[PDB]
Amino acid sequence: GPSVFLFPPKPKDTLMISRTPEVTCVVVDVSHEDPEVKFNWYVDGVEVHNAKTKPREEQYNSTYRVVSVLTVLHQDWLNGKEYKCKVSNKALPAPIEKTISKAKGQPREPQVYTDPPSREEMTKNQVSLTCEVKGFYPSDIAVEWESNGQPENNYKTTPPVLDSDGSFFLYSKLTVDKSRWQQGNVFSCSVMHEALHNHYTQKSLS
Amino acid sequence: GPSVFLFPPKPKDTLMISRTPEVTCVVVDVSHEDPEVKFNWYVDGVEVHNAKTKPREEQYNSTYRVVSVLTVLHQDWLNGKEYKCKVSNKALPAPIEKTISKAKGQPREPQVYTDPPSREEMTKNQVSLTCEVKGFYPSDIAVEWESNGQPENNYKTTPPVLDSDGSFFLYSKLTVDKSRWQQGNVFSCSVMHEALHNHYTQKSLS
Ligand SMILES: *[C@@H]1O[C@H](CO[C@@H]2O[C@@H](C)[C@@H](O)[C@@H](O)[C@@H]2O)[C@@H](O[C@@H]2O[C@H](CO)[C@@H](O[C@@H]3O[C@H](CO[C@H]4O[C@H](CO)[C@@H](O)[C@H](O)[C@@H]4O[C@@H]4O[C@H](CO)[C@@H](O)[C@H](O)[C@H]4NC(C)=O)[C@@H](O)[C@H](O[C@H]4O[C@H](CO)[C@@H](O)[C@H](O)[C@@H]4O)[C@@H]3O)[C@H](O)[C@H]2NC(C)=O)[C@H](O)[C@H]1NC(C)=O
Ligand SMILES: *[C@@H]1O[C@H](CO[C@@H]2O[C@@H](C)[C@@H](O)[C@@H](O)[C@@H]2O)[C@@H](O[C@@H]2O[C@H](CO)[C@@H](O[C@@H]3O[C@H](CO[C@H]4O[C@H](CO)[C@@H](O)[C@H](O)[C@@H]4O[C@@H]4O[C@H](CO)[C@@H](O)[C@H](O)[C@H]4NC(C)=O)[C@@H](O)[C@H](O[C@H]4O[C@H](CO)[C@@H](O)[C@H](O)[C@@H]4O)[C@@H]3O)[C@H](O)[C@H]2NC(C)=O)[C@H](O)[C@H]1NC(C)=O
Ligand SMILES: [Zn+2]
Ligand SMILES: [Zn+2]
Numbered sequence: 009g010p011s012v013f014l015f016p017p018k019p020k021d022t023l024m025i026s027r028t029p030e031v032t033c034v035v036v037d038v039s040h041e042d043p044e045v046k047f048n049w050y051v052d053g054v055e056v057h058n059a060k061t062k063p064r065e066e067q068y069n070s071t072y073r074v075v076s077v078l079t080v081l082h083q084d085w086l087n088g089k090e091y092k093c094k095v096s097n098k099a100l101p102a103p104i105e106k107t108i109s110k111a112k113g114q115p116r117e118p119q120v121y122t123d124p125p126s127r128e129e130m131t132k133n134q135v136s137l138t139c140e141v142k143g144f145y146p147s148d149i150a151v152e153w154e155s156n157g158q159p160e161n162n163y164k165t166t167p168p169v170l171d172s173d174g175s176f177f178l179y180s181k182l183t184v185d186k187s188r189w190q191q192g193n194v195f196s197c198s199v200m201h202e203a204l205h206n207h208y209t210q211k212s213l214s
Numbered sequence: 215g216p217s218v219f220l221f222p223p224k225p226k227d228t229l230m231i232s233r234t235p236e237v238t239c240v241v242v243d244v245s246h247e248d249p250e251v252k253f254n255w256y257v258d259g260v261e262v263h264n265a266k267t268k269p270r271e272e273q274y275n276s277t278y279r280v281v282s283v284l285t286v287l288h289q290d291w292l293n294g295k296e297y298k299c300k301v302s303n304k305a306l307p308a309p310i311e312k313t314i315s316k317a318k319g320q321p322r323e324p325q326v327y328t329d330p331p332s333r334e335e336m337t338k339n340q341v342s343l344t345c346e347v348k349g350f351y352p353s354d355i356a357v358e359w360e361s362n363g364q365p366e367n368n369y370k371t372t373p374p375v376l377d378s379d380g381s382f383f384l385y386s387k388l389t390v391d392k393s394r395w396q397q398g399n400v401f402s403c404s405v406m407h408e409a410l411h412n413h414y415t416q417k418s419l420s
């Protein structure tokens with residue numbers, strides 16, 4: 009019969025109050041004989057009624073796919089509230105229930121350190137600026153680079169790695185030509201994480 | 215019917231001539247009515263006959279599982295030879311063929327840099343020694359730490375990350391208490407990779 013998938017908000021949407029985090033409940037393999045789909049949403053077991061369900065959409069494999077979106081409150085998600093999607097369909101023996109929440113566990117604030125290019129690499133035409141983020145929990149995190157208000161997008165970040173103390177770490181490598189680095193330009197590593205003050209911090213390098 | 219899975223050698227076994235890399239051809243879901251399994255092995259399409267097939271082994275879901283192991287030559291694997299496992303069974307319409315080789319692509323030698331703890335972290339009771347390995351291809355790689363001939367095992371390494379030039383990088387973080395680091399002890403980052411001389415290099419820190 010039908011199958012339900014429940015997806016969390018985009019991590020960056022949970023960390024910036026300016027943005028609207030949403031949870032998305034997707035039902036696939038809805039038949040033509042049983043096309044009616046009913047969604048019920050609960051927040052910590054309390055039924056809520058402000059969800060937005062889109063009209064069914066027929067797929068190329070002859071099934072219907074229907075989606076329901078519930079906006080979530082910034083503080084609710086961060087405070088660990090649980091979001092239950094309940095899907096009812098005539099072709100089902102009983103309704104399907106899916107629950108989702110923010111990654112659970114005691115939060116731990118990242119420590120952010122920047123490291124300049126080593127001497128050996130300062131013989132190359134391009135040098136690595138490194139941002140070390142360690143000791144954070146949970147693993148949800150965003151890292152960007154900037155200089156003079158404008159973003160520096162020639163960077164790559166490792167996934168979070170589980171450390172031996174149960175927290176996470178990662179590294180972010182921004183590559184700039186010596187041209188800008190030897191002029192003394194300030195480059196900034198920006199880190200977003202729930203456990204930071206305002207979920208934000210930045211460390212500069214020069 | 216039956217299914218075949220073909221697994222490569224352990225990466226570290228391919229980089230040390232002392233060791234014996236092996237490719238392993240696993241056949242699952244062999245029935246009781248058709249228990250006979252025949253393996254044929256080819257190296258670049260040439261049939262070879264030195265493989266070691268283990269006796270069938272009945273599983274808890276009422277099927278047989280049978281495994282064939284072919285030793286591979288250090289230089290053959292590194293030189294991109296292709297290993298074909300061919301499985302024949304009466305319950306099959308036609309034999310199943312699986313081919314495997316070393317990750318393909320032009321090799322690129324890693325650059326290894328070590329970075330000492332930043333000043334900010336030197337206020338903590340434990341400091342991070344960092345080993346940056348960048349510019350390597352393919353992504354198969356091994357990284358360890360040592361000091362005075364003995365291994366330093368309190369470390370974590372990020373997975374390889376695909377860089378913007380199509381090569382890979384990673385970082386390895388060894389955590390030691392200031393006790394050993396302030397005594398001036400030499401810690402060594404050891405990197406194994408096909409494209410290094412003897413597939414090995416090391417960079418020390420102090
Ligand atoms: C009939 O067709 C249905 C529609 O599929 C589309 O229609 C045609 C055109 C086909 O060509 C399809 O290829 C095409 O995609 C099928 O629906 C799919 O069903 C499967 C299960 O049978 C679902 O698989 C599950 O996918 C989860 C991830 O889904 C995200 O990622 C997909 C890309 O990787 C993407 O297509 C999805 O839309 C969704 O993408 C995210 O959506 C959210 C919310 O909208 C966004 O917030 C994100 O930004 C999106 N991110 C990305 C990267 O797009 C998996 O998580 C899940 O793995 C789970 O199940 C596995 C086992 O399967 C477990 O092991 C695991 O632990 C976990 O529980 C799972 O694979 C798929 O999502 C459905 N696709 C869509 C679009 O809804 C029908 O299956 C098909 N039926 C038949 C009989 O043919
Ligand atoms: C009947 O039972 C068979 C035996 O399974 C065991 O028996 C009983 C006790 C059950 O309780 C089982 O849980 C138990 O495991 C089943 O065989 C299994 O079939 C599935 C497919 O149906 C196979 O899945 C495939 O697994 C690949 C990885 O396999 C490695 O990792 C497994 C753990 O993750 C491990 O169990 C395997 O032994 C193997 O482990 C490696 O072995 C090599 C060589 O020996 C070593 O060199 C490594 O060091 C080992 N590494 C590790 C970590 O152990 C996957 O790669 C593969 O994903 C592939 O297929 C998927 C789709 O499924 C693709 O999407 C993907 O792209 C890729 O192609 C796949 O999942 C599984 O390996 C089989 N298990 C064994 C032990 O052989 C039967 O399936 C089952 N049948 C029925 C009808 O019940
Ligand atoms: Zn229809
Ligand atoms: Zn719950």
Ligand SMILES: [Zn+2]
Binds near residue numbers: 025
């Ligand atoms: Zn907040």
Ligand SMILES: [Zn+2]
Binds near residue numbers: 246276
């Ligand atoms: Zn039997």
Ligand SMILES: [Zn+2]
Binds near residue numbers: 296313
């Ligand atoms: Zn081939």
Ligand SMILES: [Zn+2]
Binds near residue numbers: 288413
């Ligand atoms: Zn060699």
